[PDB]
Design an enzyme around this catalytic site. Structure first.
Site, mmCIF file in Angstrom:
data_model
loop_
_atom_site.group_PDB
_atom_site.id
_atom_site.type_symbol
_atom_site.label_atom_id
_atom_site.label_comp_id
_atom_site.label_asym_id
_atom_site.label_seq_id
_atom_site.Cartn_x
_atom_site.Cartn_y
_atom_site.Cartn_z
ATOM 1 N N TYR C 62 0.851 -1.183 0.000
ATOM 2 C CA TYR C 62 0.000 0.000 0.000
ATOM 3 C C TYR C 62 0.892 1.240 0.000
ATOM 4 C CZ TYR C 62 -4.314 -2.579 1.000
ATOM 5 O OH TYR C 62 -5.415 -3.398 0.919
ATOM 6 N N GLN C 79 -17.070 -16.265 -3.645
ATOM 7 C CA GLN C 79 -18.270 -16.726 -2.960
ATOM 8 C C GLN C 79 -18.138 -18.181 -2.519
ATOM 9 O OE1 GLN C 79 -23.133 -16.976 -3.760
ATOM 10 N NE2 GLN C 79 -21.726 -16.180 -5.319
ATOM 11 N N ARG C 85 -26.548 -14.191 -0.450
ATOM 12 C CA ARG C 85 -26.163 -13.016 -1.215
ATOM 13 C C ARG C 85 -25.606 -11.942 -0.285
ATOM 14 N NH1 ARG C 85 -28.354 -8.400 -2.022
ATOM 15 N NH2 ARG C 85 -30.404 -8.928 -1.138
ATOM 16 N N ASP C 145 -21.710 -2.027 -20.944
ATOM 17 C CA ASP C 145 -23.042 -2.236 -21.498
ATOM 18 C C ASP C 145 -23.436 -1.083 -22.415
ATOM 19 O OD1 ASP C 145 -22.625 -3.100 -18.583
ATOM 20 O OD2 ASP C 145 -24.167 -4.511 -19.239
ATOM 21 N N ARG C 148 -21.557 -1.555 -25.646
ATOM 22 C CA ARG C 148 -22.089 -2.693 -26.392
ATOM 23 C C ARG C 148 -23.427 -2.320 -27.029
ATOM 24 N NH1 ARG C 148 -20.423 -6.043 -29.750
ATOM 25 N NH2 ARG C 148 -21.775 -7.879 -30.031
ATOM 26 N N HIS C 172 -25.818 -1.996 -12.576
ATOM 27 C CA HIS C 172 -25.070 -2.846 -13.489
ATOM 28 C C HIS C 172 -25.522 -4.285 -13.273
ATOM 29 C CE1 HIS C 172 -21.915 -4.666 -15.783
ATOM 30 N NE2 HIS C 172 -21.281 -5.149 -14.730
#
Lengths: 310, 310, 310, 310
Positions: C62, C79, C85, C145, C148, C172
């Protein structure tokens, strides 16, 4: 970073154009006694930037050179009628007497890149007046001739110019020395490589290449009146090397203590170019003919400078 | 122009990414028996193109390689538990036996650029299978090692890497040869330039540089499991040289009739790379020690190739 | 200039590779608790630089982030099977609780560019933890996105992507909002331009384009297991905007006082990006359907932040 | 690919210089009645290529334009000291009568890119003489003015020029129309956006910007005597669009069947530019004042074409 250009004629403006198109620096300042000339070139070039790179090109005074890492000296006077080269040479020398101090007053830490012809003599003139270390004053010298020499050799040998190691040294002009002896391609001797590849460089081939390099200025001047596109890009490359502290090798002119016996003269030799100007010389091997040619040319340059007062 | 890549693993995909970000070709086709893998990498990379250059990256079949001027062979299989180095080599040789003729059916004029390890043996394999002239099959070879060698020397000498001429030849791996004897800077002998530069190379310095070049792959694999970012960019540069018929010099692998007495073996030497693949070898001066090292290297590769059946 | 990247996994390392290939910054520092991993990726990428641009890519602590003007946060955790979640969100928030203060301790001036998924929630987390002004923390959001979406529309209409003005806003992910209503081409309403060019957009065309944009991530993950090449380049473009104080418009995520009635939430909107991060929002015209989707999206994001305490 | 340029004066040669420095095409051919002039500019520019990109710049005959995808018409004569507008116009019209057929004889598939002033009338002349579809003959038009308008607006608003959508339409001259009403930033109305960002455009601001755009050529001509650097780069960008079949939108001049009531006249409007020239017009919304100003501009051009007989 900021780059300054004193003298907004075809050479000065072409250099500014190349710096802009190649995006070398964020700011380019053109300085010229003819205020409108500089402003016009600057605005003309500014219209090109949206189609290349974000570069702020503008006209200004010497004071506007503040913070410039490099300042190109493409200043000079139009040769008046009924005037000799020595007469004209004296005038440009006078112009430099004014320009050099002004530039340093505003930017005392910039590297000075001399472009005004005769480049070697003028580089010596700028050096004496700058009162700066030898490496801080660099002349474009034979950079274009060296590059053209490599290009013609590359075409003949069917190899990339980037792989051709060849130099044109000495005085920029008719007495420049093409160094055939120690030229290399991929590290191997040039002539050796040529023959081995079935592309031997015969005396006739060498003569053709020599004229291709040596008489370029002559042909260009005869057809368009002056040369500027080539040097503009060459200068832009040297500026880039300085701004990026590249430490790359270029055949540029600089005050040299001793060259083949000749003392205190400015001429082109392979030099390491960085943020502080030239910082080292890489003297290559030379044949007897090349060494003698360089010596005589240097001798003449020394006298030409001394006679002018430098 | 179109560039093909067979094998969409980390090396093949990294190569496609580099080609895309550097804007080397307008179209890049990734071919892999694992179609979902190729489609995923292709779409992932396609999402990057709006932020760099217009390049159509897509996954396809051998048939989609039609018109390609260069096809990168980064195909192979993952080593299985209990499988030896020699058994893996046989499986990869078999993959090339299926890949090579299918690529050439679709893109008959393509230059084949081999990346699969061991690159020298796989280059020999592809050469024999291709039934093409020796120049049409090129292996990435030691290009990364040569570049790293030049970079470390440039850093030590405080000079632009472009002015350093140093090669790594032979087998890409433990037996590669760092050619110190004839290395040059600005056209003059390395050690001599270093002396005049006040940056002499001590025995300790050379040992450090050797380990920096030679053990890089080892270090990277120990830390991330595999190498791919470096070669992806190296391969992209070689593809550019082919597409632009650059005829530049690179230390790449290719079938060689004779190397220090060793016959018909593929290894890295300085070669001219253009539209038809390699078209000339620039053999540098070697010290007796470097020659024996290279001869030994060649003999090793020769026996390995022969034992495999090539 | 120096750019830092915390998290040397595939997203972080690909961002470093893109930064190097595009020559965005002179120095890139990868930081990761797994020191060997960062060192390995850094060295791999360093081997690519001779084939692109002079960029010093290295691994550091750092402390090595001092003076960084932009720091990408691509740190996170894998995960765990059977993990909810919110629990995974909790774990990543805890990583940021350690990362954010340590980055700012070394680089108080850094603009934080959040890449960790879910990007909108993590951007909110980084904002709260940073104690910096709202504009200093920016998430990549929907940039890929949006690009695209413009790419697919450009292909359909046979016009350059640069001429298509279309946005993807909000959260997103599968809930992002494609802004068809106010999309324009060359300054003219999309649908009107489409018909005039004999390339009308049918409900069928729009549905296919929606899937091409919205399900891209899903497709790549199913075939590769993870996405990284696209975001690496997107992040590199945002870093370039920051370093050059571009002040260009990008659909990125940032803390917003109010979004369609929802207060204090982070999501993507068209924002002006420069050296201090985002410095202005250019809110586009939205249809009832698009606004409702956006509102619901903002409401869900705010709820997720509430659960975490942000 | 090859790009031809007929007329090797300052405009033609500057265009060749820009094409070379930007690396737009592999081959650039300069054609001029004054053979030595073209050879001189070609060789001068060739000396610049080693410092930028490998581009083969040469001088040649119409036959040497074989296969050119685009041919720039910067032909004409140097206004003799004492001539007048209509005179020079008629002389250049005659030059075009000689040039057009010769060019298409050697390069039947080339797009004709007209640069000669007055660009609109000369584009009409070229169109009529060519006997080619309207889209095949394109004039640089107001591209520099449009870009300058955007640059000035971007500076005032403190946003990236890339985010400013603004046009200058009609005659590339005194009657050009700056379209303020439908200009946008990030897709939203420019005027209201400037106001909301605290950078409102005052009557003084608009007047300054109008003068900055409209009077640029006057200022440059008064200080330099002629303009060329800007258009050289603008033309290079249009050539790039043609060679890459970009299909981007540019405010260029082309024969228009009808505009605001005026029939069969060439003027600048937003047009889609590709490999076959312009292939679509994107007419923006205009205020009553702007619409009337454009009507008048079109009538002025129609009258100019009439006087010349086209």
């Amino acid at each position: 970073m900021k780059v300054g250009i004193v003298g907004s004629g075809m050479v000065g403006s072409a250099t500014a154009y190349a710096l802009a198109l190649l995006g070398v620096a964020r700011e380019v300042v053109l300085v010229d006694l003819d205020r409108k000339l500089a402003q016009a070139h600057a605005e003309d070039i500014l219209h090109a930037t949206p189609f290349a790179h974000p570069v702020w090109v503008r006209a200004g005074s010497y004071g506007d050179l503040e913070g410039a890492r490099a300042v190109v000296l493409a200043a000079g006077v139009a040769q008046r009628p009924g005037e000799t080269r020595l007469q004209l040479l004296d005038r440009n020398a006078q112009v430099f007497a004014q320009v050099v101090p002004r530039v340093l007053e505003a930017a005392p830490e910039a590297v000075l890149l001399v472009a005004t012809n005769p480049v070697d003599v003028m580089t010596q003139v700028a050096y004496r007046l700058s009162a700066l270390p030898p490496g801080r004053v660099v002349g474009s010298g034979t950079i274009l001739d060296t590059a053209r020499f490599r290009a013609l050799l590359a075409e003949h040998l069917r190899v990339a110019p980037q792989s051709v190691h060849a130099y044109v040294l000495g005085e920029h002009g008719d007495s420049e020395v093409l160094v055939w002896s120690s030229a290399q391609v991929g590290g191997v001797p040039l002539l050796e490589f040529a023959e081995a590849r079935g592309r031997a460089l015969s005396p006739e081939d060498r003569a053709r290449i020599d004229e291709g390099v040596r008489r370029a200025a002559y042909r260009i001047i005869e057809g368009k009146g002056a040369t500027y596109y080539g040097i503009g890009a060459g200068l832009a490359r040297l500026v880039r090397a300085i701004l990026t502290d590249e430490k790359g090798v270029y055949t540029v002119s600089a005050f040299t203590p001793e060259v083949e016996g000749v003392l205190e003269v400015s001429l082109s030799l392979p030099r390491i170019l960085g943020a502080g100007g030239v910082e080292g010389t890489v003297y290559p091997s030379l044949s007897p003919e090349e060494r003698e040619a360089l010596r005589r040319s240097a001798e003449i340059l020394k006298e030409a400078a001394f006679a002018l007062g430098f």
